[PDB]
Design a protein around this ligand. Structure first.
Ligand SMILES: Nc1ncnc2c1ncn2[C@@H]1O[C@H](COP(=O)(O)OP(=O)(O)OP(=O)(O)O)[C@@H](O)[C@H]1O
Ligand SMILES: Nc1ncnc2c1ncn2[C@@H]1O[C@H](COP(=O)(O)OP(=O)(O)O)[C@@H](O)[C@H]1O
Ligand SMILES: Nc1ncnc2c1ncn2[C@@H]1O[C@H](COP(=O)(O)OP(=O)(O)O)[C@@H](O)[C@H]1O
Ligand SMILES: Nc1ncnc2c1ncn2[C@@H]1O[C@H](COP(=O)(O)OP(=O)(O)O)[C@@H](O)[C@H]1O
Lengths: 272, 1487, 143
């Protein structure tokens, strides 16, 4: 049947497209003491396990395609999902937009696995000190709020502060013209919708979405001073569906602007 | 009746009937009051029990009526009940007025007296003090704002805030010192309320509200008291926003007061707007956000009790309907919890009901149709529907929604902290809440983990208790040293982060796995930096633990040494016992839980002087009705359940057990069916609510502990209601188990000389049992292999220990048999080392195939230093260790016996071979110690008969078989026990022993793993067997008493778990029972055994005796590739077992029995015929059958070369007894003519349907006749429909005289109808001695239970379930008549039942017809093994080309398609193989 | 059958649904309040069509919520103006309407905190004493 041939073709294409393998991080007592290392190790383990499962499932599908393997219940359901174009439930372990189809899921999975591979290579080359200075996309990670929490814990440990007294400040600057302080973490991929960010100052624009070059997360001690009337709280959603609330940033709008207008026009930051 | 006084309409029919009957028995009405009131668990009366003095709560706080109601003046139930209700309402109102006056005296004061204030608190209830505080504060704020009406005026409302502040300060000072628990709860509630009042007054000051009509004040919940109002019930008016609610004035007892976070105030505003608009609210949101508690607190604050239904999958309607119309009549509120979980039909029904009632309620702004009755719905009725993400479409327009997305856990923590007396509550809350967020997220997910809001509240309450206890300890210390006492001074200098960390470690560290503890410590260091907690080890308790451990032969340590983790686990259990009354130890089987709590009990006994008594009760083994108690439907008599019985016994304090410490250990799995009854005991209430309504108060010294291995199927409610300690498998290492085994060996003698033997053996074995020793390395390696069953370390170690015990018994027997020469030390060491290696090989690899046994043998040879046999290739498992400490091969032990001629292939005979003797030895070892064991192996392979051979070899052990079924329940075990054993009373207690003296009863279970498991992964018979094995006794549900088992032991056998239809055994059960893997006999074993049978068989004809050896060799040789080729993978029925070889020899002997002399060619012809009837009828494809024919040709020529092929192996191999007297070969033509004549007779007599005779019909009719002739003839006919299966079966049955019976199955053909038909057939078979052909087709089967009953019949020749009671008596009478007519005189039921079974197994014949569905074939083989175990099956398939050609010619013969004009074409499209070279017209047409 | 998209159509449908007598009641400003309520409901219900942008999810801002809001406005105007022909714009309980339409009605379905913030923004922009001036803008810089 022609559907079997085309499923064979697309499975072969996906197997070529998806990366091969992912390397786990090396455990060390100094690394274990580091919370960023714990979070990235958890992410790499989850990603490698899921990649291995997906590669094995596709290999089993290809073996069924040659006829050398019979369709069991799980394989039959997975084949049905692939033919119908629907995302298999076994594959979906992390949060995914509701309408995303299989091909887009594979493309995003390939990008995520490449990011995890780069993280693992950087970690093996250096150590926790290098792992702190890695620009990581929030959308690419499986649980980005875990990454926010990891950076918070890292700063709290480094400056011997307690967690509940740490607050978040965002400094959007160009990647080239960026300063990586002790408490600053690089984050890429954030896209601002409804406004343009220049000199960490927002302005309403008719552009649908503005790509932020590089977002730096800085954790500082609570000043215990009221935010100015020009400071606006922007939600940061994981995907365009606006179903996941990762965290909330604080930006200073430009002059002659009204924060109520920012509220009405639905300005928000999107990881992807 | 219920129309008057609609408050008792709340209860159901049973309570109504009981209260009607027991109206004068006012002491029995307390159940109804418990049901319908809020907190009123009883009504206070006098000694006369004729006047109602007042009402009381479940806690103990009581209300005395101002004017008591005398039941005598109003004999009617409803009249005096209404009087009691009105009286409690009036008394609550009057007490409210009095306490409002008191607090108004307390209010408007710069400072307040703690002594008078605490007296005011103790005078009234918690409810009344909270309401008095609310009313006083609301009146003060109203007065202040009325004074604010001028505007731009000085604000004395600052004075109101200062008053609230000063009273808050005195409350904070009050709770630091010790208080009575009820007063402690009163203080906690009052502090919660005043914290809320202070916050809202601060907000009012911030907003500078100066008008009483300002909405910022109006949105706050206001209480107005009007004493001048005549009606006491209408005196208190509660108003928030534009809504007005009159206070219910119902007694709520004592309730958990809810902190009013911003979200909770939003909820109150939304719900009061909904109710004022006369429609219910639906606070949707995720679980654990206060969706239900918010509604409850709103009801309590308005004086209304809420009935929170739990909307699980198992939800009742009739009870719900009655209870819910009762709420409608009463007027009290009702809340639905997780309303979406309902079944869609139940969802629609309940939605329709609430829609009708809501429509009625809006009509009221009055009766409505409910349960075909008129229900008067009070205006104050309210309905709330908590949902988890929507509302049903018929309700979306009648219910307001509200989002409980996130509760304010930070402010909840702050308010509870400040309630417990903590200073710096804000910092502690802002620290603790993110800490549990981190615990929920960062920590690895586990089933038993819980980091919800409830866990936070528990941690905070525990921290408050810890701080109080530290305050008390410092107070006592200052009392001892010096005299300066000042509670404020102690509190100020008391660290508070340390206390909270200590509570966190005391409550959460126990439930963590070994890996998560460093992460938790890192999290604490991250949130609470610089501060650490180190537990002060109870050096008093540690010595007692060391003493008890030394006493019990255990391993004890402190911290990092061996066993330190287990000691810490015991101490954590001690702390949980100290801070909780109900516990639950969780840990994989083999973690020390049982020993942990046992050692802790002994140490506490020897320390505090309070001796402890343990009541170890298996919950799943016993029935729930017997566990909790039975109430007769008709006589209404209550018999206490075993748990209820033991609670009653302990409460009775007959022999001072209230002084003692009783630990009822619920050893076993837990599931939410029985424990839901226990949810009422594990709460702070601590009381058992029986179905009869009577309760028994839990004594303080009684601890209910649930030693459960895992918590995958326990509900979150039970998880939260009791403490948890996690016993990881890493707790006890292999070293501790080895040390325990060695110590128990050295101390307790096995039955002293033999104690010295045990000590010497332990000394010998000590180097091998050390850490990183031979045993540990082998066990690590053995875990790497694969086993027929799941591997458990304790199972292998227990098997090794048992076999070492047998080694010691062997040495003792040797010395007893050699009094002149006791065995010297050198031979002792040699024998013990070699027996050790033997025991590792047969214990660690005692449940694996030969390949992994050989692999383990090579590995141990590599890693041991003990001298081993120098066999170049023979594995050492094939070698035993002789009593002289030398390696002797097992083959020497194998004899060479000659079976009798008449006993060939008999069920009883068993030829001993290598596997037989080895398994005889292991069975001997494991039955000497009375350790239950399971034989796991493939179908056949002689598992059953090997077991019976070993057992009947032993004289003093009787045997009773029990064919376990997929529906087997322990009542079968009870019936067997009362059948063969008798309960006897002894000073130790009632003991169950066989009625026969000096006999060890064994209960062989045919399929121990066959019984199905419940929805909660539990097999009841498995749990019951585990209970009697591990506890050494069981529970007699008749009187609920410990019954000790004596001279009773169990043995099992089972197919592999991987085989479909079998459920894997629980690791808790497998830990006790060693498993031996009885594999298929090898080529040598089969060769020897069937050579013995053949040499027994061929004694009939001496002239052919010399051919027995080549015949057996060929018999095994062909079977080898027959098993090797048609593996089970190709087809589900492609199994081969030595059962087939036995059937082969049985068939050959049956053929050779009548014949006097017979040449070699006849023997080979018979041999080939039986080979084709056994190994060739099962095949599907034609090429497989050609393969079988070619290979049988090759085998016959290989092992019989000097023979003619044409005569010995003429292609039409047909055998039949129809023509001749004997079962001699029959020619195809003569057989065809005879069967054609018989078919003519069949047409003349029975149904006339033409049946053309192609040679496939000949073959099939001969096979079917051969199977019917053999006793217990059962056939599995498979082939496409219409292929002749049923027709040929009927033809054979009529020819051989069997009556054809088929069940007329229709759509209404239920299981009872099939059972009735099967009973009818059984009666027609044995009681009449008339052979029946039972027609079965899968179309006639509508349920798997049909296959289960048929499986039982096929495997046992009878099913006991069919006949019982009067049916069984009628069967007894009928079989007695049959025995009398046949000439056999029997009286007892057992002998006649056995004769009936024999009659059925020799007469009744079941044939199963089905379509060749390969997946279907696999499914049926999975469902019922009997259809594949012994039933022979034939492959009819579809008609071949030859059959089609013959049908075509024979059927189209009347017509004349003879055309002389026909010309033969050059090319003829032949499809028929035997088409004549010149095709005629008719031949061409049929082709 | 579908509701015709459009603020004009939505307001016409709302005015048709509301009975003629209910809007024309003793205080003359009740008609103005009902017009503001209708305009607000049209603004809310229209923003649903732009689901990712106008809101966070497709809320059910149906006719039942509008009926409840109208009921609340009637109740609070009757409570504030007890049978008075005219009521001053400032004396109108603006805070009651704002709070009840942010928490009870239109606020029950709102789970995301940012949707609640946006709802508060519309409510505090529209419902205020300033609206009773002829210069008030129901919308700004529409084109
Ligand atoms: N402290 C100890 N030192 C040495 N051996 C011990 C110790 N505690 C228990 N054992 C042994 O280890 C095994 C554990 O026994 P126990 O019945 O307590 O296990 P368990 O894991 O609680 O069992 P289950 O889950 O089946 O109820 C027993 O053989 C016991 O003799
Ligand atoms: N102000 C509050 N809001 C919400 N929950 C609270 C509050 N105070 C205490 N709790 C606790 O929250 C816990 C969970 O509430 P519950 O009704 O189980 O939520 P759900 O309705 O999601 O099941 C309760 O045990 C209760 O003790
Ligand atoms: N070593 C053996 N000695 C005697 N009989 C054997 C042996 N191996 C297999 N058998 C055959 O196996 C059959 C018994 O198997 P059975 O007890 O029915 O297995 P199960 O009880 O597991 O179904 C007997 O008919 C017997 O002929
Ligand atoms: N050898 C045969 N020659 C001609 N017709 C046959 C033969 N065997 C069966 N039939 C036909 O098959 C029909 C019965 O089919 P049956 O055997 O009941 O199907 P199944 O084998 O599925 O039970 C009869 O009507 C009969 O005509």
């Amino acid at each position: 049947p022609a559907w079997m041939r085309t499923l064979h073709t697309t499975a072969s294409n996906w197997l070529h497209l998806i990366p091969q393998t992912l390397s786990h991080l090396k455990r060390t007592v100094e690394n274990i003491k580091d919370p960023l290392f714990r979070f990235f190790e958890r992410e790499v383990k989850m990603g490698a396990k899921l990649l291995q499962d997906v590669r094995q499932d596709l290999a089993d599908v290809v073996q069924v395609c040659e006829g050398k393997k019979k369709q069991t219940n799980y394989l039959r359901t997975l084949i049905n999902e692939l033919v119908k174009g629907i995302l298999p439930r076994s594959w979906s372990h992390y949060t995914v937009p509701a309408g995303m189809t299989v091909i887009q899921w594979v493309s995003d999975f390939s990008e995520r696995i490449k990011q995890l591979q780069n993280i693992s290579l950087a970690a093996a080359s250096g150590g926790a000190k290098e792992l702190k200075n890695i620009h990581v996309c929030l959308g690419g990670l499986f649980v980005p709020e875990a990454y926010i929490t990891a950076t918070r814990q890292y700063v709290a440990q480094a400056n011997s502060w307690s967690l509940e007294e740490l607050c978040l400040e965002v400094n959007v600057t160009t990647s080239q013209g960026a300063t990586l302080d002790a408490c600053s973490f690089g984050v890429t991929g954030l896209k601002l919708q409804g406004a343009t960010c220049n000199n960490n100052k927002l302005s309403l624009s008719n552009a649908i979405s503005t790509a932020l070059p590089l977002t730096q997360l800085r954790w500082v001690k609570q000043t215990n001073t009221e935010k100015k009337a020009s400071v606006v709280t922007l939600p940061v959603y994981l995907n365009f569906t606006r179903a996941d609330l990762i965290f909330t940033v604080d930006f200073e709008i430009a002059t002659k602007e009204d924060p109520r207008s920012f509220y009405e026009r639905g300005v928000a930051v999107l990881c992807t | 009746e219920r129309s008057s006084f609609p408050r008792f309409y709340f209860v159901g029919d049973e309570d109504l009937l009981e209260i009607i009957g027991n109206s004068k028995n006012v002491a029995k009405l307390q159940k109804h009051f418990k049901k319908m009131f809020a907190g009123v668990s009883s009504i206070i009366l006098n000694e006369d029990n004729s006047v109602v003095l007042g009402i009381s709560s479940r806690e103990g706080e009581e209300v005395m009526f101002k004017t008591p109601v005398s039941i005598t003046e109003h004999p009617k139930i409803n009249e005096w009940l209404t009087l009691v209700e009105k009286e409690m309402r009036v008394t609550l109102a009057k007490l409210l007025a009095e306490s409002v006056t008191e607090v108004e005296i307390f209010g408007k004061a710069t400072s307040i007296d703690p002594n008078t204030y605490i007296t005011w608190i103790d005078k009234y209830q918690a409810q009344l003090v909270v309401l008095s505080a609310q009313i006083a504060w609301s009146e003060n704020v109203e007065t202040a704002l009325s004074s604010m009406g001028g505007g731009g005026d000085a604000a004395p409302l600052h004075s109101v805030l200062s008053n609230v502040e000063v009273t808050l300060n005195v409350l904070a000072d009050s709770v630091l010192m010790e208080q009575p628990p009820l007063r402690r709860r009163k203080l906690e509630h009052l502090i919660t309320e005043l914290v809320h009042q202070r916050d809202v007054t601060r907000s009012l000051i911030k907003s500078k509200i100066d008008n009483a009509k300002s909405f910022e004040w109006l949105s706050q919940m206001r209480f107005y008291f009007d004493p001048k109002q005549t009606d006491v019930l209408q005196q208190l008016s509660i108003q928030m926003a534009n809504a007005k609610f009159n206070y219910g004035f119902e007694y709520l007892g004592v309730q958990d007061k809810l902190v009013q976070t911003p979200l909770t105030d939003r909820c109150y505003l939304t719900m009061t707007q909904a109710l004022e608009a006369r429609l219910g609210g639906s606070p949707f949101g995720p679980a654990g956000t206060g969706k239900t508690e918010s509604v409850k607190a709103l009801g309590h604050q308005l004086g209304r009790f809420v009935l929170v239904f739990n909307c699980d999958e198992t939800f009742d309607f009739q009870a719900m309907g009655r209870i819910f119309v009762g709420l409608c009549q009463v007027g009290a509120w009702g809340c639905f919890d997780e309303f979406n979980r309902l079944e869609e039909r139940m969802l629609s029904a309940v939605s329709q009901q609430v829609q009708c009632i809501q429509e009625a309620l809006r009509e009221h702004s009055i009766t409505c149709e409910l349960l075909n009755k008129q229900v008067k719905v009070s205006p104050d009725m309210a309905i709330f529907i908590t949902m988890n993400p929507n509302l049903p479409d018929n309700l979306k327009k009648l219910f307001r929604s509200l989002a409980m997305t996130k509760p304010d856990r930070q402010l909840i923590a702050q308010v509870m902290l400040y309630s417990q007396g903590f200073r710096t509550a804000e910092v502690l809350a802002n620290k603790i809440v993110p800490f549990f967020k981190l615990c929920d997220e960062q920590l690895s997910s586990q089933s038993h983990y819980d980091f919800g809001l409830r866990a936070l509240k528990s941690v905070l309450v525990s921290a408050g208790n810890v701080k109080r206890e530290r305050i008390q300890k410092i107070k006592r210390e200052k009392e001892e040293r010096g005299e300066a006492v000042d509670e404020g001074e102690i509190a100020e200098n008391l660290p508070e982060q340390e206390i909270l960390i200590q509570s966190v470690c005391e409550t959460m560290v126990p439930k963590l796995v070994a890996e998560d503890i460093p992460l938790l410590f890192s999290l604490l260091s991250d949130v609470f930096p610089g501060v650490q907690y180190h537990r002060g080890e109870m050096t008093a308790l540690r010595e007692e633990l060391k003493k008890v451990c030394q006493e019990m032969y255990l391993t004890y340590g402190d911290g990092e040494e061996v066993g330190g983790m287990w000691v810490e686990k015991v101490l954590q259990l001690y702390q949980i016992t100290q801070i909780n009354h109900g516990l639950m130890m969780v840990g994989p089987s083999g973690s020390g839980k049982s020993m942990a709590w046992r050692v802790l009990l002994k140490a506490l006994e020897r320390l505090e002087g309070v001796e402890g008594v343990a009541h170890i009760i298996d919950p799943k083994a016993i029935s729930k009705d017997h566990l909790y108690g039975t109430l007769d439907p008709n006589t209404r008599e209550w018999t206490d359940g075993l748990f209820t019985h033991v609670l009653r016994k302990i409460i009775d304090s007959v022999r001072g057990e209230l002084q003692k410490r009783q630990w009822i250990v619920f050893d076993g799995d837990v599931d939410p069916e029985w424990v839901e009854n226990l949810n009422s005991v594990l709460d702070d209430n601590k009381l058992l609510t029986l179905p009869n309504g009577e309760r028994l108060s839990l004594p303080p010294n009684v601890r209910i502990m649930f030693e459960v291995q895992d918590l995958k199927y326990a509900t979150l409610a039970t998880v939260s209601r009791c403490g948890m300690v996690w016993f990881s498998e890493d707790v006890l290492s292999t070293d501790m188990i080895f040390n325990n085994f060695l110590a128990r060996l050295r101390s307790i003698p096995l039955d002293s000389p033999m104690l010295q033997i045990q000590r010497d053996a332990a000394t010998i074995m000590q180097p091998y049992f050390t850490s990183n020793g031979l045993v540990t390395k082998a066990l690590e390696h053995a875990f790497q292999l694969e086993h027929i069953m799941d591997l458990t370390r304790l199972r292998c170690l227990g098997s090794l220990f048992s076999m070492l015990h047998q080694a010691c018994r062997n040495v003792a027997q040797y010395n007893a048999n050699h009094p002149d020469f006791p065995m010297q030390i050198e031979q002792l060491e040699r024998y013990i080392q070699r027996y050790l290696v033997y025991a590792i090989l047969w214990s660690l690899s005692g449940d694996s195939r030969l390949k992994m046994r050989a692999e383990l043998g090579e590995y141990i040879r590599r890693i041991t230093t003990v001298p081993l046999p120098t066999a170049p290739n023979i594995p050492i498992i094939d070698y035993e260790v002789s009593i002289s400490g030398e390696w002797s091969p097992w083959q020497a032990k194998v004899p060479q016996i000659e079976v009798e001629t008449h006993k060939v292939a008999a069920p009883d005979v068993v030829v001993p071979t290598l596997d037989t003797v080895r398994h005889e030895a292991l069975l001997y070892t494991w039955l000497a110690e009375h350790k239950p064991l399971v034989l796991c192996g493939p179908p056949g392979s002689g598992k059953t008969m090997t077991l019976f051979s070993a057992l009947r070899a032993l004289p003093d052990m009787e045997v009773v078989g029990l064919n376990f079924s997929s529906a087997t329940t322990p009542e079968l075990l009870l019936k067997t026990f009362d059948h063969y054993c008798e309960y006897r009373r002894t000073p130790n207690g009632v003991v169950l022993a066989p009625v026969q003296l000096g006999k060890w009863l064994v209960l062989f279970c045919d399929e121990i793993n066959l019984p199905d498991m419940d929805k909660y992964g539990t097999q009841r018979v498995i749990s019951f067997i585990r209970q009697m094995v591990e506890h050494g006794g069981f529970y007699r549900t008749s009187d609920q008493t410990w019954v000790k088992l004596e001279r009773i032991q169990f043995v099992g056998a089972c197919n592999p778990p991987t085989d479909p239809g079998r459920k894997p055994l629980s690791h808790r059960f497998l830990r006790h029972v060693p498993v031996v893997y009885v594999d298929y006999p090898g080529p040598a074993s089969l060769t020897q055994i069937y050579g013995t049978f053949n040499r027994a068989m061929l004694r009939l004809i001496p002239s052919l005796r010399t051919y027995a050896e080549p015949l057996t060799a060929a018999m095994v040789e062909f079977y080898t590739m027959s098993q090797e080729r048609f593996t089970q993978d190709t087809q589900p029925h492609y199994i081969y077992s030595p059962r087939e070889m036995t059937r082969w020899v049985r068939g050959i002997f049956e053929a050779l029995r009548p014949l006097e002399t017979l040449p070699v060619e006849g023997l080979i012809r018979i041999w080939a015929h039986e080979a084709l009837r056994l190994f060739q009828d099962r095949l599907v494809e034609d090429e497989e059958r050609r393969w079988t024919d070619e290979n049988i040709d090759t085998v016959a020529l290989k092992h019989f070369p000097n023979i003619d092929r044409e005569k010995a192996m003429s292609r039409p191999i047909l055998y039949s007894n129809w023509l001749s007297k004997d079962y001699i070969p029959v020619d195809q033509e003569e057989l065809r003519d005879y069967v054609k004549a018989r078919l003519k007779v069949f047409y003349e007599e029975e149904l006339d349907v033409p049946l053309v005779l192609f040679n496939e019909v000949l073959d099939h009719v001969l096979r079917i006749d051969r199977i019917f002739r053999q006793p217990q003839g059962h056939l599995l006919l498979i082939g496409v429909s219409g292929a002749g299966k049923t027709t040929l079966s009927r033809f054979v049955a009529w020819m051989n005289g069997l009556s054809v019976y088929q069940i007329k199955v229709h759509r209404k053909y239920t299981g009872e109808d099939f059972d009735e038909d099967l009973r009818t057939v059984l009666r027609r078979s044995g009681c009449k001695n008339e052979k029946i052909a039972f027609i079965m087709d899968e179309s006639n089967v509508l349920d798997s239970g049909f296959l289960e009953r048929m499986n039982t019949l096929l495997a046992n020749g009878e099913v006991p379930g069919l006949f019982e009671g009067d049916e069984y008596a009628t069967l007894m009478t009928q079989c007695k008549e049959g025995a009398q007519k046949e000439g056999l005189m029997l009286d007892s039921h057992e002998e006649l039942y056995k004769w009936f079974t024999s009659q059925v197994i020799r007469n009744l014949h079941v044939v199963f017809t089905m379509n060749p569905s390969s997946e279907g074939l696999k499914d049926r083989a999975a469902t019922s093994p009997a259809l594949f175990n012994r039933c022979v099956l034939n492959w009819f398939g579809d008609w071949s080309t030859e059959a089609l050609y013959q049908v075509g010619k024979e059927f189209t013969s009347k017509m004349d398609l003879e055309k002389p004009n026909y010309i033969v074409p050059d090319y003829m499209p032949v499809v028929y193989d035997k088409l004549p070279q010149p095709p005629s017209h008719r031949e061409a047409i049929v082709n | 059958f579908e509701p015709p998209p459009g603020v004009k159509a939505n307001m016409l449908r709302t005015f048709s649904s509301i009975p003629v007598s209910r809007i024309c009641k003793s205080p003359n400003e009740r008609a103005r309040l009902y017009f503001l309520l209708a305009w607000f409901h049209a603004i809310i219900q229209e923003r649903l069509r732009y689901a990712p942008l106008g809101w966070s999810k497709k809320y059910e801002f149906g006719e039942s919520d509008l009926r409840s809001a109208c009921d609340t406005v009637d109740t609070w105007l009757d409570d504030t103006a007890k049978g008075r022909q005219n009521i001053s714009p400032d004396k109108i309980p603006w805070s009651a309407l704002k709070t009840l339409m942010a928490q009870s009605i239109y606020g029950g379905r709102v789970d995301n905190e940012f949707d609640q913030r946006l709802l508060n923004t519309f409510l505090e922009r529209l419902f205020t004493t300033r609206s009773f001036d002829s210069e008030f803008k129901l919308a700004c810089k529409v084109d």
